[PDB]
Amino acid sequence: NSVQQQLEALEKSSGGRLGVALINTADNSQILYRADERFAMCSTSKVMAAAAVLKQSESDKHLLNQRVEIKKSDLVNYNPIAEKHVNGTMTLAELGAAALQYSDNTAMNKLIAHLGGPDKVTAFARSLGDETFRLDRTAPTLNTAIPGDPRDTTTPLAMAQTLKNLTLGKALAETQRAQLVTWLKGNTTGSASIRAGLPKSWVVGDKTGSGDYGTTNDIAVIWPENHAPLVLVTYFTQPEQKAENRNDILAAAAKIVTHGF
Numbered sequence: 001n002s003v004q005q006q007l008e009a010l011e012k013s014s015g016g017r018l019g020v021a022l023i024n025t026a027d028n029s030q031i032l033y034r035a036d037e038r039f040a041m042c043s044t045s046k047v048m049a050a051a052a053v054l055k056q057s058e059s060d061k062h063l064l065n066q067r068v069e070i071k072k073s074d075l076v077n078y079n080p081i082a083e084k085h086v087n088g089t090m091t092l093a094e095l096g097a098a099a100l101q102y103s104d105n106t107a108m109n110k111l112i113a114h115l116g117g118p119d120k121v122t123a124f125a126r127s128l129g130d131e132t133f134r135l136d137r138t139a140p141t142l143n144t145a146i147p148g149d150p151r152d153t154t155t156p157l158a159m160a161q162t163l164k165n166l167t168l169g170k171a172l173a174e175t176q177r178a179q180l181v182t183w184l185k186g187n188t189t190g191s192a193s194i195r196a197g198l199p200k201s202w203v204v205g206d207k208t209g210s211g212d213y214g215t216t217n218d219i220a221v222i223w224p225e226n227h228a229p230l231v232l233v234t235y236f237t238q239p240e241q242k243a244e245n246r247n248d249i250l251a252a253a254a255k256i257v258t259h260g261f
């Protein structure tokens with residue numbers, strides 16, 4: 001059956017709500033499912049915060065190497081990199097890397113604080129023409145993912161469009177675009193998500209997120225061996241607060257929409 005029928009069936013089996021946007025950059029075609037509906041981004045929002053700092057670095061050649069003091073009081077619920085550096089410093093570049101490649105929540109908070117608060121991340125998204133994205137809170141509370149709560153949400157299509165702009169398009173100057181792509185390609189947290197639904201040897205950059213309501217997300221740029229890149233957002237959320245996260249659904253969605261590519 002059709003891709004749309006396959007996605008609807010996946011959602012029907014899932015016990016939740018699935019959002020997919022794939023952009024095929026060969027022809028700008030799209031595979032869209034609930035793509036204009038809002039989902040909690042959870043830690044996928046870290047891409048926007050890191051990119052906002054990269055944008056600033058365009059016009060400040062010392063920014064990425066700027067020291068940031070890490071204190072015990074900065075630690076939150078999940079901070080495997082920052083905790084190694086308590087009482088020392090990390091650079092803004094190191095905080096970008098930690099936020100993106102390990103989903104270090106303390107690192108995300110340092111980026112947000114540097115920028116001047118969640119609303120500055122929203123303003124950066126808007127500067128890229130993304131009217132949908134909003135960041136409202138710091139970590140960990142940006143991951144509460146309560147159904148119908150607009151805070152810290154976007155739509156799959158808005159995020160796919162912005163991720164394409166960030167990684168392959170016009171958002172960032174070249175050195176900064178390349179840095180973002182390097183970070184995403186080196187992600188350690190995404191093995192079981194979009195990547196698991198794709199050929200093992202395809203190059204992928206991604207950022208995952210997970211929150212309450214079993215909210216399980218991944219946003220990716222995918223480089224096939226013989227085809228133009230694909231940009232893929234897979235968001236998934238469930239009705240019950242303490243639902244298990246479901247990375248397998250993201251892998252399954254990725255397999256469905258990349259068939260034939």
Ligand SMILES: *C(=O)[C@@H](NC(=O)/C(=N\OC(C)(C)C(=O)O)c1csc(N)n1)[C@@H]1N=C(C(=O)O)C(=C)CS1
Pocket residue numbers: 042043044077078102103104105140141142143144189207208209210211212245
């Ligand atoms: C981003 O999504 C972050 N998520 C969280 O901090 C929340 N939970 O995530 C973990 C701890 C993995 C979970 O048990 O689901 C969270 C904060 S408030 C709330 N109700 N939940 C980070 N993201 C990931 C990721 O999947 O990318 C992590 C690897 C580290 S936490």
